[model samples]
Target: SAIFAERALLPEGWARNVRFEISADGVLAEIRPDANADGAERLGGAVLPGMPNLHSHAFQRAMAGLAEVAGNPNDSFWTWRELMYRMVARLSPEQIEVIACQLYIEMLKAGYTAVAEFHYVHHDLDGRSYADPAELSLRISRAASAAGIGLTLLPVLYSHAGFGGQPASEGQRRFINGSEAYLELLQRLRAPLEAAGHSLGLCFHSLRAVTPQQIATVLAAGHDDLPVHIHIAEQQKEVDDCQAWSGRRPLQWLYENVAVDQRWCLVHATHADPAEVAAMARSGAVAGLCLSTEANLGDGIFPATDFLAQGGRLGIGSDSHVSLSVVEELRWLEYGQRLRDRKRNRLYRDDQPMIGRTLYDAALAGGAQALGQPIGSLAVGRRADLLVLDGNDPYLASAEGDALLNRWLFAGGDRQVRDVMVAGRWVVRDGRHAGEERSARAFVQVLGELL
Candidate 1:
């Protein structure tokens, strides 16, 4: 009926002899620290709330490591995208479910308990909507449900190919949806997603992918309180393109035109001036930093120091998932800052002095906000999402209670994660998922079809 831990990280700070109970519906019922176990199930090691992956392209998981070898001397993100579009042309909804299921299992083992899927592929091979407009999204929900990971299904609206309402190319057909169709798609999927214990949000693939009128049209049509996500300022070329079109940069246009607030997740604000960064931070919008994908694509570093200094919120996303470990994402988040600012421990603070703890706490809160889910902490009324690190691992073994996070996050090498519980159910125990082997087999079969 309850779970006990030798050590646990509470929202106020860390504690000892913690006992927490989950309601039948999976909400945290109570959290009592410095208490006796009292016949509760004993857990070995420190207990921390699971990390939320704020962004993902679940279909791209199948093609992750295949795009590394270069071709043209000027090979870039666009070049890599051509290969991605080629694979996108063939992935059936069935294949996508398999890949996503396997991907979620990997995320659980690596300590990401939930994800916001920035899904765009919506049509059949010939670029026509299926009998069900929500076909692809349904498969994604099925995968998340089966894998027991909390999911925020952000159905993407990608209408154009470039800034100023440029015509979409043939490769863009699968992702295109008029504002009317987009709103209707959300209506059809909303009740189902809610029923499945999954969340839903609105997404524009990027500024280049949708026109202002289309954006205005969709935003005007109610759903006023849903989390609104968009890709912005991720590439230098995108910035140049936006400046050429509107005489302003991406974030500038966004802040001046839209109601930028806590509900807005500005994915990859990677190129901006100090003023833009300061204004964005002040606007209460989360800069959804997908650092690993940005690094892989040569996207410039976000103004993290300035943003955080000005009190901006931030969260991590594996994006293309070159690496899915929460440890790797949070580690690289700080390391990238250090390399940029030429300073050590750039993401730390006087209160949250430790780099690992600071990074994890920021992400937990920011990601929960982005996903629009009742997660990211072990508080009462929150989902029972537990990530227990294997404290007995040699690397973490005998480490001081305060030192465990530093060890698991920095020196643990992606190990020490022994169990994962999302919404009160143990989807992974002893670092293994019950469906891991079957999911892996199906995923490889999808790869064969893809190749």
Candidate 2:
């Protein structure tokens, strides 16, 4: 399969008259520059390798902005979570599947070609295991299939409610599963997910939700090769609580207890100190930053400058679907830093002066690695996941060189995404997905019923 673009951001930077030669297996077989368009499908505008959303909660997307009303005097992530728990109690398999399908379409249209879903909802509303342990997992997988977005299905392990393995509260029942059951659930999903061409990984919901023994046990059970993810150090309250419980910070405890390495993706380490940031960077773990969600939840800013200064890797995600725009995440990531330090181009390097280019490239590589997939770049041995921007968009048309990318990230929005190709297949073309209306209709119905 050959697709031609007027210009595309190649590994060496933007190249002209770019032609991508995709293999039958969806990998980029070859990429030719200044190539003829005589025998290829022509993309309508400037192209970029699609953004990989490194963290998400598919069900939470359905409840986006519903938790905005003031509930407590001190509104926070913990306060917001109660509203989320209300939705969890009512969601059926069909509803979850419908919600995920719609959310994937939104993601694709927003330039997120792939996602790493940090899924935790598992049991029936009654807290009973389903007849099929993988009932919810299968629903999410089917949603991804229907939507045609690449997925990294990360089934989460949630047992306790707080630090030191406190018994889960009633609202937490649906997401609860013991370590033994969690491993069995993974075993059930492992082969089927691989068969469907999607990858699988393990997630510990948080340091508070799982014990050191549970973490050690799961990895010991022949699951050493899969990517390991965990929610750690997101809120200052969590840091304070963790310190009170164990005399160590979340990242500090985990690194000391587990074998931290590249295979691990530490999500939302926002409260990490300089020492923990240095250790995370040195260990090669990707700091999974969901800037929009972090801001919405009032989680503190991550020490990104110090982290990257020490060679730390980072990626972006739309965790709660409060904002799914790829540009929004990238912009706020840099914008948040600027707001804090009163400095522009906070992620600057002597060699990489273009802030947009630097941020995009780092996220592209880091997101791909966090997903444990080969789909970030338009290079050999990588999936042909690319987005063609709408040339007619006035802001995009007036740009040149990295300025185009600069406009795309700093000045443009998702409407500029005209076509999306995931692994050599056109899932979205001309700004509409084939399943958009259908999924959207069902999504509205589900929300109506949910409300």
Candidate 3:
């Protein structure tokens, strides 16, 4: 199949009258710019690579607005945790499939072609292993298939409640798994996921949840090439707890103890100091930032300005599903920095001074690295994942070059994302997903029964 765009963002820069030829296997076999369309399908607008969401909890989409009431005046992530556990306590496998399918559809319509699902709910409501141990995992995979979204499934290891291997609380029972059990889960889920054209990765719930010995055990069980993700210092209290437990902060402990490298993703390292930030940059792990959820949960701002200045990799996620739009994630990421530093245009290199262009390119590279997927670009060898914007949008009119990016990211949310293609298939067209109505019906039915 062939697709021609009036203008498209290329690896080097923007080009006009660009054409992409997609191979039957879903790879882009050729990309030509400043060339003729011949008999190709026309995408009448500016085109950009669809963004990858580096972190997500698909089940939490059902609880998006349920926890906003004033629970504790000192309301914190801990309080939010209680609500999350409450919501997921009785969610059956069928329910998870319904919610995840709808969430994936929403993600596609909002310009994210793929998601790295940090899935942790493993057992039945009674906290017993399912007959098919990978029951929930298969449900997530089926949901991705139903929605036509690319997925990198990261099954989480949750064994404890706190830093010193404290026993998990009753609320955490469903998520707990020993290192051996976790390794088996990985193996059991691998073949089916790969056969479905999805990737699988491993995750540690947090330093507080997994002990040092278990970390070593899990890492030893997995192949070195599999991507590893962990929740890090998203809160000051977490930093304080880690220091008390091991005399080092979360990132510091991981860097010193593990072989921190590109295969790792440190999600929500929001409270890192300058030294840790520089060390993480040098270590080559991507900082998976979920800006919308961070703001919603009152997590501290990540040291993105310093991290990027030191050459740190960065990716965006719609964690908690407070907002599903990649445009909102990118916009608030820059906006958060602007509000904190009391300045403007704080996240651009001198050589690449366009904020929108620079952030978009960095997110594409960093997100792909975090997911361990060969996506995030429009190249001959990459998957044909692209978004065709509506050039007629008032904000995008008379825009060219980096100005077009600014219009897309800053001017409006995802209203201009008129079409979305993932792996050479048009899952979304003219601002609607192909399976939206079906997924929405299932989602509403499940919610009505649950709520």
Candidate 4:
């Protein structure tokens, strides 16, 4: 009596048949060649490890379509911010939970088994602290638990509206907190998150928000070694303002001042100069990029090709929830480079090795490092968060060996994700979330109620 599995008849070039025999205690007792076995799964095609979504704003899932309407003659991230300011007022704890629950469920279906939520939305609409300070943070935790996705909760420190410790605007009321309050909030938030089998990380909202003194104070509380993420140089105005305030660019200032090591994940370093790019590579911080969101916001492209060439680490995110699929993110990440360079296969290393596999492997490694997690690949020690793709489709027609993974990324005809599992349990099946319809219906109801 034996358990048999075949990932797909057709294979990716480098993919190998990985067979495991479990002991009575359900541990993988052996890994060996099985003459009759293949790497394909119960589903038609192939199975790979699920991706880590390195950044998210969970509540913003509700505002996804609201920003698309034409409002200003010149639309940009700043203009969109005003609309976001309005949307933030509509969220109560219940609404946040509903929205986040749906967002996390969707993420699981799209093969994002774990998320690093860069959450800052706290307090009530009137800028008053709730009796429980982490009201909003717990909503996110509940959403993650209900959705059954791994979470790295980053409770953000957002105190000001601009560089040099400027006062926060009325719109930013919910996000503002002093160092003491933020520390207290972090302490409170860590307990329940630990209970939930999730990591409790820290985030500084952006370069514009915290002053040098404030940043130092927050980091001094022995939390500097924690998984620290920050929003850096996303917009042109941010660079200009940082220059006005300190005469240095955001990444430049950060490189000069912060003790940035592998523990840091600098999100949206979109406006770096060549010097900044090389310095960022030297710093050993992972670039937390969200390609689709950057394109959607019309933000300038990151120097990814150059950064990678210089040996920088990067991981992708569904920032703003624009798109959830990792395949789409990796495809667009390379395509964005292709468009900029006016070349085909620009990021591909060599012919024998596919760009898709390279990008995918990079994400798996870099994302795990950035989030302070022990899980990424399908190794024995890694958590079992994996995706099984339906390979019997047209896009995978000629996909054999490494070419299979390449096509899954670039040749996008149909969505190939067939089943997804997290922590060795099925969360999505038949290319849909196990609880998707119910969650979607609940989400629609919640959204309608909020509006």
Candidate 5:
């Protein structure tokens, strides 16, 4: 009776007939009711581990449909970037925080308890640093902290415009940073993250930004104990350019050069070949795949089947903020394979044949690895991040085991989440964020100004 644990939400499945008691300090004291007696808490639909969204550009959440028009004869991620740059150029720190806070709230409500923000918006619209080097980063930290979501702050280093270290265009002015300035900005970004109980991860925007020597200088300096995320071969153009620049693909160049391991999260390795996928499998680094965003932007499918078969890792992200649904991401991940190969159950694990369960487990494992954190589990030492669903609906009725995953993935709407808890605190209750109204007002205000 000391721990008050009853089959505490597990990542994969229910642990039958379990009970535990813990101390006031959140340490496990004892397990009671040996496997025979059914614990009271296990009577309802079981709890599942919350997800970590491994890659996000929080500001883009505000620009969801703003880039959908035919702004150019050929609209692509490249054209989208122009609009994104214009939006970032106009945002003040206060506005950034407002947008980020809203984004974080939505993330939590959607079952992502933590986020690795690939934050790159720095300096003023006029290309001048504020009095504080980390003004924008601090705003992100405050926004996430206020919303009670875990933050892995990836301070991005963007200097060049192309693979061969070309000069950045004027639109990239706010994001450009030299090596020393990048290091200094990261150092400043770290303090607030630590103070707010978050992690600081440095990001190499890509080969386009940092050169070989510059990357070596950075990886040598602060490569000690933080997740290092980078934008990898998301587009074919990037991969082709990497080959043109170094006669090797992006993943090929990266694996050969850097110590790609669990500490590294290569965002959107969407264009990898078989060799690159195998290399990622061997390296044990996470391919930070943003499924919904990729589909939204018409980015091609990742080699999920090959990657998984090779034991490669994958974590979902809300990149570009087109959608923020773990269920949707997981569903689409499997669905993509089905579409490509005309096969069903391609992503199903032998132990768990359910689609939702498999997807959820993959996202949890990959998210934890990519974010460089001890999350993705409701274990004794892990953070107390959890989600509870209202299974009373007809679709969710009689749901158990794999069926739970099916309902959530196929039918559960965004508001189907009844309550969400992160780090032992309730942030979303009754299918609504505690700050939804206020956050919406601020978001609308900012959007109004931008419009």
Candidate 6:
């Protein structure tokens, strides 16, 4: 199938009368700009590559607004996590499928064509091993299939509770897995994930949740050259604990110990100092920043200016499902910096003063790297995942070039998204998912039962 866009952001830049030829296998075989419209399906309005969400906890979508009330004087991420753990205890395999399906639908409608699911909930309610060790992981894959979203399933490794190999509390029992047991789970998951047309990756929950030996053992056992992700120093308490335990901060310790490389994504390096930022930038790992969720949880701002200045790779996520719009993620990413240094255009190169173009391009590249997928751009040989905006919208009527991108990023919300395609399939059209109503109905029923 061939689709033509009046104006599309190609890998090089925006071009008019661009045509994309999608192979039967859903790959872009050819991308022609300033070409004829022979028999191609015409897609109206502006088109940009669909963003890849680099980090997500799919089950957390149901509990998005439930933890907002303050239970203590200092309601912190720790407090929010306690609420999350309580919610985790109530989820069954069926419920996991239901919620994840709903979340992926919302993600597609919000303009994210792919998600790197950092999934960890593994065992039964009683902390007993399931008959199928990969029950939850399979459920997540099934959910992604139901919503027609491309998925990179990162089954997380969670063992201990805190720094220094502390014993995991009962609350974490469902997520904890020893190295041998975890590898078994990953092995069990491989066939199911492959069968579902999803990619498989691995993740360490955090430095506080695993020992150094376990990290090494898991990496060795699951050596497939796939993407590896980890939670790193999102909270100040986490940074302090890492210093107390290893005599080095989390990023510092990981860089010195692990072979930090492009295959890794360091989620929420929010508390990194300038020195750690520089080291992480040089390490080639993508900084997986969840802008809205970080703000929602009061996780401190990431040192993106220093990191980007040093040529760090970065991507955005809707971690914790506080918000799902990739546009919102990019907006707050720059907004956070503006409020911080009390200046404008904090993320731009000297040559590229267009903040929107710079952020969109960087996120497209970095998010694809973090997910280990050939997505995040409208170009030849990549998956045909993209968004079509409503150009007739009053906010975008007079915009062109970088101005159009600026409006989309800073002003246009999900309502501006007219259609979304993933793997050359129209999963979303007219800003609605085909399965949105059915998924929402099932989700409400399950949520009512849980609450």
User: What is candidate 3's lDDT per residue for 1-451, written digit by digit as tens?
Assistant: 9999889999888999998999998899999998789999988689999899999999899999788999667899889988899999979999999999999999999989999999999999888999999999999999999899999999999999998899999999899899889999999987999899999998999998999999898888747888999989998888999999999988889989998899999999998988899999998899999998999899979989999998999999998998998888888899999999999998898789999998999999999999998888888899999898998886786899899898888887788899999999999999988788988888899999887
Model 2, span 1-451: residue lDDT tens: 8999888999898999987899998889989999899789988889999999999999998889888888678898877888899999999999999999999999999999999999999999999999999999999998998999999999999999988889999999999999999999999998889887899998999988888789888888987777889999998888899899989998998888898999999999998988899999999999999999999999979999889888899899999999989999889999999999998989866678888988998899899999999978889889989999988888888887788888988988778989999978999999899999999899999999998
For residues 1-451, could you state the per-residue lDDT of candidate 1 as single tens digits?
A: 6999988988888888998988999899999999999998899788989999999999888888889997988789999999999988888889989989999999999989999999999989888999999999999999999999999999999999898788999998899898999999999998899899899999999999999998898889888889999989998899999999999999999988888899988898999789899888898888899888998898978878778878889899989888888888888888898998888978876677788888888889889899989888889999999888887787676775557888888888557888899989999898899999999888888888888
RMSD of 5: 2.7
Looking at model 6, how many pairs of residues clash? 0
Residue-pair clashes, model 1: 0
Candidate 6 lDDT over residue span 239-263, tens digit each:
8888888799889999999888999
Question: Global lDDT of each model?
Answer: 0.89, 0.91, 0.91, 0.80, 0.80, 0.91
Error of 2 at 185 (Å): 1.1
lDDT assessment of candidate 3: 0.91
Cα TM-score of candidate 3: 0.99
Error of 1 at 411 (Å): 1.3
Cα lDDT, model 4, residue 380: 51
Candidate 4 stretches with Cα past 4 Å from truth are 1-13, 20-44, 350-353
Clashing residue pairs in all predictions, respectively, total 0, 0, 0, 12, 5, 0
Pairs clashing in candidate 6? none
Give stretches of model 5 more than 4 Å off: 1-12, 17-45
